[model samples]
Target chain A: MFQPLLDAYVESASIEKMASKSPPPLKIAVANWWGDEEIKEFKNSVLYFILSQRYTITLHQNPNEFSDLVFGNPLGSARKILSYQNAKRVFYTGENESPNFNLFDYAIGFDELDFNDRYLRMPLYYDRLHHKAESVNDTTAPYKLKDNSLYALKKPSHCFKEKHPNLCAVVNDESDPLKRGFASFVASNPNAPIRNAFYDALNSIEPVTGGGSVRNTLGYNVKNKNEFLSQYKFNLCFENTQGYGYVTEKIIDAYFSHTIPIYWGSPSVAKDFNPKSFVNVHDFKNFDEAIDYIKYLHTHKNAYLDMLYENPLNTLDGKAYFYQNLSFKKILAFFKTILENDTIYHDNP
Target chain B: MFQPLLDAYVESASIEKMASKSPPPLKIAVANWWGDEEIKEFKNSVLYFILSQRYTITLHQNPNEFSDLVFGNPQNAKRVFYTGENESPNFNLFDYAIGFDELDFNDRYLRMPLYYDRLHHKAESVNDTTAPYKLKDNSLYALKKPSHCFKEKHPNLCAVVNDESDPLKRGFASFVASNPNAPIRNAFYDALNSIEPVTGGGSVRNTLGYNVKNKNEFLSQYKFNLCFENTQGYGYVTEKIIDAYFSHTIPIYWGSPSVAKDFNPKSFVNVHDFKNFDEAIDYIKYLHTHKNAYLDMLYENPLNTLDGKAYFYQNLSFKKILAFFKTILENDTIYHDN
Candidate 1:
């Protein structure tokens, strides 16, 4: 019962694909001595912030010049590290790569930061925090930041009223053929004859591929949103974590194209959002298990895939905004409140 | 008791730093197709493999040709897939990506039948296979093909050493200053502060980086091997994973670098051999708990940083072989065969 509803929600989504890197609002200041490349990440993240109309972040070669708070008592042999060993209040800024523990009052900086060095683990890219926020919130956020109010390249001329037309796609490549390597993926296991049983099941229920009844597989050019998702029923999304946590352009593109999405990634990849509608591969124990169920669903096409298209939330609109977590605004507001509070500073003192 | 032995072992081996897209083998093939940049990773990984004399692999492309192997399938694709869904033994060799299903015999092309897919699973790399030579008796046979041997610059380097005394010195740059963002060592937990109260009895031991020792003081030099003990230690060897997995130089790496590969994250990341996901996570958590977070662990002596150097058993020399030296070595091997 639950599977059918979840399947419908994902299937009903108007699958469209066309998205790109989001421009941020703020340009942040990176402090201390850092390599030029890492500095570039800071600049890029700040660019995102700037595009977002948040705050423009700038990088500072010298820490003392920019940051208001510094660990006055130096601790290292050549230079002192500013840890809040003995400080007034603990304001932590979880960073991208190697989450830092800048112990001082509130301020932004990277390297590393862990909440009590516990739950607050940050990945290298600022996007990871956004990804983290989504998983924690159980709702989706504006990753691509698409708006019908501000039209993007207009949709194609053809118009159709059909709801969930079953669309499917997958990524295939076999360069790294698994031999009996020490690596488990390549480990020696004579389970082929045992394994093909599942494949037979998949092929039996496999939807038609290409300019036919339903399944349209847009191969490698998958990077293009419109090329892949515009008329498709489902776009299978998978992205390797680029350092920290990332929702990748796939999730964002799926939303942008208004295409229903089936995703594969770490459970925490969507750490902030609820998987209420989307299909997370982890929900299945193994691929065979998912194939078995999906094959069964293929038997009842209209009832399985197109039925959910009737709902209003399935369309791309502000109504769907609640799906992606936007609570980060509240967290940001809390930070602003902290900055406004002189009393808050006094209490820590 | 186990803790002391483990600690002692860690302090006895020589540490080696890892460098490049190199795997432990000497001549590995990136196997997949690519443009100029993708080709670069292949070239670099192969260069590392060759210089290390560790691998000599084939870059098998032509997916249509995969029909030969009747039983050499890897099951990964059936698990996670991308653009297409054609379940065959030969994967889309252009992407270096694989599925667990390929191990099945129904989908592979094995023209030269040295070993079957089932036999391949029990082996670690191409070098560690059970030979079919003593066919009648069914005993493990070592390969005689020198061409297939992964040739690396140094074939005798044991991947992991515990102490700092060996010839192989591994210089390590861990998470500490690796990131300039959050510069503090510990995330400023209160328990990390005040050495006397805890050291003052009932607990009588305070934290090291908190009050006893200062920050920046923790930044040590890059030694031969660095134990990337990311917080919550059990298997949480952060810096270690990147060092050994990414940089193929060598690694007397700690944490789960030794065994996390079993978790099926290999094509995703390289993990050295050690233990499993569960054990690694447990011990690391214990070390971080308040009871173990003591101040006395702090040492200004540069030698203190050498605590995890050259531990043996974890270290083994992999680069030496010859005909004259082969007989004695082979004959005595039966003594320890059991």
Candidate 2:
């Protein structure tokens, strides 16, 4: 069944639909908070990819115009994008997607795909699942670090701040009241039960990045976390504190940075989806062991961790374990199946 | 309007009802994993209040037999507890109460009143539409030391942990996982995002509370969060990340805990609401600062930190809140003006 699917891909040239002499490169529109530098960085990174992928990507400050995918700020202009008749998909970041949700047909990156089935498909390249960064390395080679960590790190930060104001004021200002004011006001009391725990924790630790000291004394000029993170052979996967699971950008960061990831966010639920090459903290007792393992894997580059970053470019390799053993190509096959369905477009009703 | 409501509460005390010994105290038939723990602690802590107020509470493990308020296992139980004759005031925790919400409302001690309108008395309570934490305590107070650290700091670790968890973990773990196991297995992989920029500073830092540091290896660990919403505060409040906010456990946090206690369960949602047999999944992703906004706020707490232990205890000031509760208890002024 799998071999025939590969044959189908090889023979599916009838539907290949290559660029018509660069005919506007299948115009894709992304809606995020534009005008902030950090946002610009994130956008540019993707924009670079879209350009490389031979797609003309448009950045929308407001998602009012018709486009292929509506990206961020779902409340602002998403309705406008969703209202369009020609849009291909509505992509959600970690921002607007909900769990147990059948809202959007797909997510922009797998980071936002919170479903159980998607969980199992994470390690596999199930085509329908969200896509993270395009893996630059080929399978069977050691996932190579892009050598210039500082140069690579600057792209997202430098680009985003140049794009959005809200993102700028948010990312740069240490005491940006505009950012902190609204959340503080909603807490009801200084010691709101919900936020109090975090407040206590913040008071205890020094920000290695921002330089905010835990004790009342405020400090400044903390070292950049990216610099520290880049030193480690493995990428540290950051999951949201909301639920236990995996998302795509984190996976992309792991792959793109040439670091094996010691994943912590979604846990066994996510473990249910990923390949064994990725180290899940649920498999270990705590972060200490997880770190030690990353350090150990860093020293012995050929051990279990090496398998995770294998086949960096072949997203199709991941689809083999869709139900059990989907590969990346199989993931695309599933999408081909669904995408190839009878055309009675439900929204037309 | 507030004064009159309070006056009404004072006026409507049923002396005749108290004289009849509180009608055998409504049995709270709890059918959750929390078992008798919450019931017992509730009976203990509130015993003084219950005894003092001459109110009695009965324990019912099964709603089929006992309970004026049936707190049953949403996954297993189908029975409803209401009086045979009198019209039943709906006992709902909104969608979260009914296991309808996605895992976004991870097990934080939750209650969705399901549009109960208990908070409908005043729109002003929502405060300004600023979308932030409503409370303000700019003057720094002694922040609560870590639970593990509190003992060494105050030599009162046992008392503090025992004090908080008793009521906090009641009927079930204050944090819970409403999600189920996945059909797709062994494919779950997680990758961490790069460093987030520090507010007001160029230093790149991981947002503090969001990342649960297990050790030198920092991991985002929050399995369930005890969710409670503040009426006045807007945006994302910290009720969604109680455990994780403290950087302790993976918060099985609640999205809108108040949505459960203050609104109708059917009106909200969780994991079991969809899928066959409702798999209780514990998965979440942040869309924007709306959820992480509250987390970002906590990242800025060094300007004012309170004693964590005392601060947590202060929330249980149910007696104080109950004084407000007494006003409503007497008036029996059901919200009619919705």
Candidate 3:
């Protein structure tokens, strides 16, 4: 199995090729990633794979030893970060939060914010599946650690036409009035007002099977979202927070499972995906208007399959787009630039 | 002719349409906006354009009205308009630095490029038929324009690059250099002049008797504009390169190591992208000799690429800016430094 991001990095011929004369293990320590288990999956992390390419990577518990780089998420506060007063503090987040420049020396995120060569836009979806695979008993994964000595690109699941050609049939759930439905909406947090509002509103029209812990209509939670969503015609793939370029696995997971995702995050989601591929809520006038279109697609089997067949990246071949689009080559170039010159670390305010 | 950013803003009417729910519009005043003409050009300014969509905005020299907030460079006024040539926001003073940066501080900053607003306004003026592409009469103060050729049929893609009346004499030439000291600016100017005579019409090296009164009008006749910036930093791109795009001339650009974020890389010659000025100069000569190659670059729209304008204007649009500012207006408190 191939980790797409890491595979992209390894495939590219970089400045590192010529400058191979100089380098280091550059002792690295990471913290505040999704969980302690996630922090340990360096083999699965893109930055770790890159660091391994450049250095021997002596993993350390304490960054207070003036570690070359310390990666942490915005989910945790800066002061609370395990790294002390030294290390090249690197901020990384898949969430909708921005890097607090009060400390972090560099960042890699979804948006290409002007950081004077200090940031990289990774979009944070490929990593989502990588991390998910590490935790679960292998859910739907596009790539795995290594079938090709470091990576192997996973063949994407067979699309809807071959798999689920007929119109979406009704699904079984806990036989409550609000439980039996066609679509699936599985999210953990109920605090997301916009997401919860849509979850509640979508149910009012036709009961959406809620199998997540927050609103489990199945009477229990589902570990594998891909398997849960694979049976459904549509998935209400709303993000936890709404911001420009703040897209997550919710939408990508839907497309991976071959369901028509009703996406509602990243105002510029069309930039990454073909608009015809998924039902973008931003195109509609209001929530009710969005719901109306969903119902419209629900009845029209041809229309639902048409969206399912549309490639995420507009290409004749889906795998080519994944190789071209989801590569960590750009991030490799950025870090290479920084690794060459340490002065750029804190050159600006 | 193609400005994707302005089109993106126009494409999404949500910023303009959805901002109708507020009570009394928040009062905002801005300072250090380059000049009073720019300050007065409220509709043209990106900050003003977005703010006006969300609130009632006032530009400098204010007294009659009470200001809800103030946007300025390095000010304690809470929301700082920091276009300091890629300088970091001194989070020590202001609550926000609403300039372009990918800093995760979206709560404290909004990533709006000064170039997008500046370049958009320039395009806005030229696109208007009444504004006129060519100068009719030179005035002591105001240049009188002729009745524009708006009645004419639209030109095809080839015509846009070919029919400017200037012959392709080595193809690359145009400049309005005011900085005499910039090493790369002066360096590229002379190196480019070596291939074919590059006309200089600015204070730095005026070969022509007069200086360019209107750069866009002067560029209307030329095949290219040597529009390099004095400063070179990532995302520090100014209107220099964009001014070329507006005039349908290929821009010879430098400054902003990552110029593609500001424009389509194929659309212009980024000198910084090359190893040195000589490498860039080599590319320039190639474009001039190859007419199809030059036009191919010219055919590119300014706002483009896989990660270019898509990620840029996404966070930098009116909706994002208005969202950040309204919360500032709602909170109604200026905090101490980070």
Candidate 4:
């Protein structure tokens, strides 16, 4: 699985090929983002933040008068707000929900679907953490940032700290932990049972503590998700749901923390991630075997320590991001296409 | 263990730092080397090879007039061989011993490490594409062809070519032809073999064959190579581990504690780094079965680390090693028996 970095700056080539050293200055408005869309918050979001380098982006409450493009996600009233706007409709989704092509002129998503060359397949990870780095001036409270991203240009200082006892997990509620398995969508299953099952199985071997409303034996939710995870040897970073094209920042947090992510969800997750960096729940024949694997690591000092030193971003298997059609340049050029062309489609939702 | 070309062109810097390719040539002669043939195979090869870039060199069965300066290893071992036992030959014999002894009472004694000469040898420092890294069959060939084989293709070539002895084929291999009597080498080999079969390609355990001469080329075919030295000593790291490195194999090293300071400790599986031999075996098994974990090990630079224990980088300069000898060659007249 591992090959030598035959070339030292091999990844720099990847970074250069993905997003150029600079971004173009374009006036853009973003809506229905998960958190504070203030200027600082907007830039903190990797996409706009990276765009902030050469571009002007704002958290527009509504489609405004002086915006070149209005990017909207399917959150809260974002659909209703943008539904009435006359701006260029750029639909975005970090969630598993595929884009409704009829409602927007252009879209970037995990959706493999395309209409009149209007859709680009981009995951939330497609936009990497800013290479220039966000500054201390930015507010302390922010969405979870996946630092030391492999695809991104700059390499973060390695965080090889001694881990705390066992494993750790974090989820908001375990949200009515009961649900049906056959449901097609992630939310349909509420808090993924697999997530809880993993915690139970591994916790049986050694206490798998976490910051969660349902499972917060830690007494309270951790103030800093990344920091708490950094203290733990393995992180149970199961996604909210399982499906292809649904990878999120959960795995990234484990990687950034130098905590091996006990990663599950997205059976084809290996498409972007170098499986060696984390313990993929999918690789094991059964959950017990997987748990045994971690127990083995816990018992063996060198085996566990060896994992901490691995480079998280190596696609030694090969750079699947480009060949698999998930390059940042593809999306950036898609954005350029939206700007360069004026044709508008009013396909019905 | 340190994995191969994990960081391609990683040593581009090693060669980059060695004396920008220069100086006046001198005729140097080497004798009494332990096991050198054709002057470039064993410990003598790297010494002669590195010097050839800046000087003319030859091997003499005995000292000759054509040679300006003569250097020899007069040890029962490299140390014992080079620093001839207090039987100093009448104030002078060969002018110097490129050795590891601290005995500097004699000007004839120059303290240098065999590890430095072998690592800083000419093969590691080349920046040009012409030398063409002897890339593994499955290396990122386009990138593998010249300067850096780091950029890779998507196909999992190791998985495709599965063989136990042929490491890229999936099994670990041992090319330890040098030592049979060494207890730890066979112990490590057997311990790891129980975890997974390690093909013995050399005469020591010779399960596959008695001897394999294309040591470098044959080593490149495997994923991990049992790179144990015949004896354990500080600064006693030999060409075994370094040789495995150029082939891009993860060398399971068990010789020097100083190896932690001499090379990137995390880059290879240093047996001394483990709690014990048993724990080291478990770690190797962890690497073998865990593809993601194993692949993760490959991106580290194979040469040196800085500002820390791996100070070997500081000494990896050919100019520094050459300067030790060059100053001696500049002598007015050979010291004569008084």
The most accurate candidate by DockQ is 3
Top of the candidates by TM-score = 3
lDDT of each: 0.28, 0.31, 0.61, 0.53
Query: Which of the CAPRI classes, incorrect, acceptable, medium or high, describes model 1?
Result: incorrect
Q: How would you encode candidate 4's per-residue C-alpha lDDT over A233-273 as one tens digit per residue? A: 67777777654556776665565444667778776677666
Tell me the lDDT of candidate 4.
Answer: 0.53
- Give the deviation of candidate 3 from the true structure as CA RMSD: 14.3
What is the lDDT, from 0 to 100, of the residue B101 in candidate 3?
54
Question: Which has the better DockQ: candidate 2, or candidate 3?
Answer: 3
TM-score against native, each model:
0.29, 0.31, 0.50, 0.39
Scored against the native two-chain complex, candidate 3 gets a DockQ of 0.09
RMSD of 2: 28.2
**Ordering by lDDT:** 3, 4, 2, 1
- Provide the lDDT at A18 for model 3: 25
Instruction: Give per-residue CA lDDT, model 2, range A1-349, as digits (tens).
Output: 0122222222221123336556353334554545577555555452233233334555545445554444432454554545453344433344313321222333333332222222223232222121212221222112222433211222222332233333223223332321121000011134333233433432233221222232212243323322223323444344433232334445444433233455554443343334444656657765555556544554464674355435332235544222234333334443344334432121221
Q: How much of the true contact map at the interface does candidate 4 reproduce, as a fraction?
A: 0.00
Model 2 complex DockQ against the native? 0.01
- List where candidate 1 sits over 4 angstroms from the true fold: A1-27, A31-98, A102-223, A241-248, A268-276, A297-299, A306-328, A334-349, B1-338
Q: What TM-score would you give candidate 2 relative to the actual structure?
A: 0.31
lDDT of 2 by residue, B10-108 (tens): 222212234644534544555555546655653443222322354465665653573334443322222232111111112222111222222222322
Off by over 4 Å in 2: A1-29, A36-73, A76-89, A99-227, A230-238, A242-245, A248-261, A269-279, A284-349, B1-338
Worst 10 residues of 1 chain A by lDDT: A178-187
Candidates 1 and 4 compared by DockQ, better number:
1
Task: Return the candidate ranking by DockQ, descending.
Answer: 3, 2, 1, 4
